[PDB]
Design a binder for this molecule. Sequence first.
Ligand code: HEM
Length: 184
Amino acid sequence: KCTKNALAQTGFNKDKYFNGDVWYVTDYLDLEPDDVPKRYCAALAAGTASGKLKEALYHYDPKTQDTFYDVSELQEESPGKYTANFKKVEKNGNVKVDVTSGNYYTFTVMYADDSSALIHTCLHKGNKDLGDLYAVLNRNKDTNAGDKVKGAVTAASLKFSDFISTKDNKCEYDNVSLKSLLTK
Ligand code: HEM
């Protein structure tokens, strides 16, 4: 199951966060880890297009070189708290899996900077919690978590030592497609 108490950042700035730029996941904490291990890479670009909040996701498996994209229209449940109804797409926006009722993830921006963030995400595929995931984002894929985001982790009653770093995961990102998917 998932957490639903994750508290949004007080005085969270949307304009800065949803600037249409790319966020890299430098570290994460998966409360519900799979039986089969898989060192992953992920990035996202959150922005505005056509008058709506949009988010584009990217997942990469270095080992298999497998890549998958997603694009969702966001609905604000409260500033910092969002619900995303995703659609799996080709890197050019061609839909592989349409939006579906049982399909959506929700996330909370627990802390945000000009250069870093801490989010809580809860993914549901086929209406069923798939577990809690906590991520440390950064606008730069090479920066280690700063004192501020780590304070935020602590403030949420978590342990950063429990976070896994995607640093030497041999990641590769497609920021061009990530940003362009924003309009799809
Ligand atoms: C930045 C936050 C992230 C968001 C918002 C997010 C969102 C999602 C979404 C929407 C899917 C479904 C794609 C589809 O089938 O169309 C997915 C699948 C997946 N993600 Fe993430 N994800 C994030 C971070 C990560 C990280 C860091 C890992 C590494 C632990 C991870 C591992 C996976 C795996 C293994 C799948 C497929 C599992 C399944 O289909 O149940 N994700 N993610």
